[PDB]
Write a protein that binds this DNA or RNA. Sequence first.
RNA 1: AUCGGCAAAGGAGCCCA
RNA 2: AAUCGGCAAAGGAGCCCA
Lengths: 190, 192
Amino acid sequence: NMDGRIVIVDDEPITRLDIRDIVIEAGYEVVGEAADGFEAIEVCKKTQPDLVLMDIQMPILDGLKAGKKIVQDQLASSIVFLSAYSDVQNTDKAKKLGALGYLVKPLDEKSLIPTIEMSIERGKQTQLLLSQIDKLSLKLEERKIIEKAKGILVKENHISEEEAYQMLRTLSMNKRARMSEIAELIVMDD
Amino acid sequence: SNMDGRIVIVDDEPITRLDIRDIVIEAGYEVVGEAADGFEAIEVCKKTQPDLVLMDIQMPILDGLKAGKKIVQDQLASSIVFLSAYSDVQNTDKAKKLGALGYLVKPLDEKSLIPTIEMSIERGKQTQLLLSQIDKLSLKLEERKIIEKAKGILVKENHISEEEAYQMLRTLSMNKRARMSEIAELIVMDDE
RNA sequence: AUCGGCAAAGGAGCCCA
RNA sequence: AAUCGGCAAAGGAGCCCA
Ligand code: BEF
Ligand code: BEF
């Protein structure tokens, strides 16, 4: 049966429990619940769920603004709204902040589980791309700092690039630290 | 009022294609084509390059899942949303794996369609931005090896520091307003 | 005297019970 | 001497067009 970790957010517990039944029957893990945007933020912060289901109209903080915080900080992998509100203002706001689905009340208990599976998977793949972008842009920070470190080290010692790389390689290995970090220190040095 | 987006509709029951067509046009979208089987679905996407594809699973010739895989992996459309009576667990696994952005179930809840369209269009665009940023970084990381040769040539020929040689190459490439890789190619062939 | 980890792999160093 | 746009940098503040 289905696999995924889910957080449920609505101010009306009646709807919150309808969802809770459907989702657990399908076999997901319901890890937390919230009745307002602040409980929702703190629950996600602790939880790190795969999906957050939430209503726009809540007390304290509408799901739009709480969702904005959730996605900005990356407290959850994917987020899907459901509300009886579907005016274009709320639709644009939800799509801009980065929702992966939006369902209109009263919810289609038939569509829900499929849209859950889609939103979880596309959430994961989006997190993979962000990690690949992070990894590449880091490696491209590293080579710049490394090349600066080669240059400054050659200027101070008056030696060749092979010896400069050998110095960085021996230091990083001896000191159990990335050549990139050693280079950042040496470049800050001058 | 006045939604923007370009859509293609794909189902074997023409009554449902017309019900959908009427809804999306009333919202303000542009329908740019329709199909009634997987083979026309791929061909229409090749021509139109739409923002969103709406398709049933059970279609003749090529099930919507097979056309959906092709459309996604060749990027013939920026986002894709299924709409079927089939909610079968195997069908949801296939649809999410190939790369759907939504999976509504027949008979459709018309209220829900337009929001899921807007979300799926935006998520499709954003996913293509991220893929473009990956292509740009990985290219610029390959340019580095040519730039590192051009740097080495400057430090020898001028008899200067690495930080001075890069500062020269950068100020040159900005002055001549050309990609450092292009200036690096010119220098490295000039030494040859 | 032995196990484990980080770094390097343009390698073969370092730390811990 | 200034502003609009564009190219390139971003290991940054540089260059072209009205
Ligand atoms: F508060 Be939800 F919009 F029912
Ligand atoms: F008729 Be399709 F399978 F929804």
